[PDB]
Subunit: 212 residues, 2 copies
């Protein structure tokens, strides 16, 4: 999304990366925003729990704020790879372009990019591309991945150890639906594999995870 | 840029493209935004000289508003081609993504896409890509 928060978080991330203290004046100067504007925005981020102002008044991203900053930097750099590797955009405009793009590019497009690009280790500007492992390039909860139209997915985990109800244990074994098995999912959530279809119960639907 | 103005202009273009009359109520419904909100935004657009509210309370885009409406549709359609032809994004997600990208793509990227893509005549959805001539490509 085209967030001011995302802009702020990625900026804190960038400074830290450069070995710079996430001081508010550095953020403002970097974002060209004024001191009062950054404080107004930082105070808003603290309430959303994405940042915290350290002792030295430097800004520390909470785990959530950091996960977000990382996604944004991932999309940013993945965008730059597309821009130079495929599109061929003037190298002097690739960064400024990607600054907008990091805000609109979806996770799905990032995975396609990771598959279609030759090397996604670094950005054209020599910086490592973060969050790839979180992008998935374990899984997503079947119930969350469950669309009203049948889609094929690869079983990531069944969380058998966390289940209280085990009635569906043999049912999945008969349907040959195991870890690594490419099985269809939909939205009750019925997983289909080996031709057979297992209509998951609430507990398994929430727990079983599948990648893409 | 991610303008609401751009969102309104591209929506009027779309309606026109369907042979539908750009009525404030149709824009409201297409954008989901409320009637007052549309009236409020259309008012601002008029003042910027991008649209005029015609006799039948239909919205006519000034030549300026139409140049922009078209540029946006062009980036939209050029984006969709990149997503389907190169990136290989799921066809069922191409439009919504392009709906975001149309606001951020630059004219330099479009010219590059025009050069790198095999056919920029239509979008993956059969609609003709407008403004190519004005892009200078
Ligand atoms: Zn960059
Ligand atoms: Zn579209």
């Amino acid at each position: 999304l085209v967030d001011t928060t995302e802009m702020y978080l990625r900026t804190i991330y960038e400074l830290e990366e450069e070995g710079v203290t996430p001081l508010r004046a550095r953020i403002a100067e970097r974002l060209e925003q004024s001191g009062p504007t950054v404080s107004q925005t930082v105070a808003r981020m603290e309430r959303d729990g994405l940042v915290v102002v350290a002792s030295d008044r430097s800004l520390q991203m909470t785990p959530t704020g950091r996960t977000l900053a990382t996604a944004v930097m991932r999309k940013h750099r993945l965008a730059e790879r597309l821009l130079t590797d495929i599109i061929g955009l003037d190298i002097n405009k690739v960064h400024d372009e990607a600054c907008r793009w990091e805000h609109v590019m979806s996770d799905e497009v990032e995975r396609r990019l990771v598959k279609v690009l030759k090397d996604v280790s670094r950005s054209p500007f020599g910086n490592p591309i973060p969050g790839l492992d979180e992008l998935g390039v374990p899984g997503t909860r079947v119930i969350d991945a469950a669309t009203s139209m049948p889609r094929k997915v690869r079983i990531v985990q069944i969380n058998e150890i966390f289940q209280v109800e085990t009635d569906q244990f043999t049912q999945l074994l008969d349907a040959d639906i195991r870890v690594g098995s490419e099985v269809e999912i939909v939205d009750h959530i019925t997983l289909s594999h080996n031709g057979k279809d297992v209509e998951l119960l609430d507990d398994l639907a929430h727990t079983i995870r599948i990648e893409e």
